[PDB]
């Protein structure tokens, strides 16, 4: 059978908070089967844990945050993205602050992390959601997708008129039958406008942005003096942030993600519509990984 996967020692980062700029501490831990990922405020008295679910998530304004009263965990996206690209189904996450450090602004820190701490196997069926039927859901012309498929898929559209982005692909989609998360996806940085970066730091937000962890655009050109890791930086960004929102569902994904000009809120809109909805989704074991339509090998 495809087993449920923890990490298989504790391993520990330190960076700042996007938005905050507070310098804080990671910790990824083991758990037990069936734990799922939780994240704990371990600066906090009492200690707060909040689950990596989409029930949990209170803002989404150009990131996820988890809430629990007036307990936030800011910022999980890019962690959560590595975790769904390694298959991680349990882990304990420590942070000594509200916001998960940046680091260069991808997935590709937590990655090194985990494969450095070695992954687990654990006695226990792996459990996949897969989709059964489509669901949607819109704001505007910005729209989130989920549609059946044999496998695993993110696909993603992104649609900029301003000169730097004339000519660029800004769409892929990806079949992670034959596409490597780690090698693909995952060191694709964040990326900011000028004037949104500009907007925010005149309010005293996004403290910790830096041109060493985010790329920087202005209506005509990439700032970043080395330009971008992949061709399609930014719209694998936009697929890195869907994967890392799609882990809330609690499971990996047997199905297709579509997104159009999509963002945090409206990918975590889309989970909770399609938890919601039971005809249209269900929950599958593989006794027999070969019969799978996915390989996490
Ligand atoms: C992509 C989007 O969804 C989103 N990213 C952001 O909203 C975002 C916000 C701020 C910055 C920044 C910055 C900076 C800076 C700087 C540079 C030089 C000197 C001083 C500061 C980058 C991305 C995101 O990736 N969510 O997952
Ligand atoms: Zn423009
Ligand atoms: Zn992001």
Redesign the pocket.
């Given at each position: 059978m495809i087993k449920q996967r923890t990490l298989k020692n504790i391993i520990r980062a330190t960076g700042v908070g996007?938005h905050s700029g507070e310098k804080v501490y990671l910790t990824l831990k083991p758990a037990p089967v069936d734990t799922g990922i939780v994240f704990s405020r371990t600066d906090l008295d009492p200690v707060v844990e909040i689950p990596a679910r989409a029930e949990n998530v209170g803002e989404t304004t150009?990131?996820t945050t988890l809430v629990k009263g007036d307990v936030k965990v800011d910022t999980v996206?890019?962690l959560l993205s590595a975790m769904a690209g390694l298959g991680i189904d349990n882990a304990y996450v420590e942070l000594s602050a509200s916001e998960v450090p940046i680091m260069d602004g991808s997935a590709g820190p937590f990655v090194f992390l985990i494969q450095s701490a070695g992954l687990q196997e654990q006695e226990a069926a792996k459990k996949f959601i897969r989709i059964k039927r489509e669901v949607s859901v819109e704001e505007g012309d910005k729209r989130a997708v989920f549609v059946p498929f044999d496998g695993f898929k993110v696909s993603f559209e992104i649609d900029f008129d301003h000169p730097v982005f004339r000519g660029r692909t800004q769409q892929a989609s990806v079949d992670f039958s034959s596409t490597s998360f780690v090698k693909e996806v995952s060191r694709a940085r964040?990326?900011?406008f000028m004037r949104d970066?500009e907007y925010?730091?005149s309010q005293n937000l996004?403290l910790g942005?830096?041109?060493e962890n985010?790329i920087?655009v202005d209506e005509n050109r990439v700032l970043n003096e080395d330009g971008l890791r992949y061709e399609d930086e930014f719209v694998k960004?936009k697929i890195l942030?869907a994967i890392g929102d799609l882990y809330l569902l609690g499971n990996s994904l047997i199905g297709e993600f579509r997104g159009f000009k999509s963002?945090?809120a409206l990918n975590n809109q889309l989970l909770r519509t399609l938890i919601a909805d039971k005809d249209a989704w269900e929950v599958v074991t593989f006794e027999d990984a070969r019969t799978a339509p996915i390989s996490y090998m």
């Open positions: 996007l150009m990131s996206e890019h964040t990326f900011g970066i925010l730091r996004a942005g830096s041109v985010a920087v960004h942030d963002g945090h």
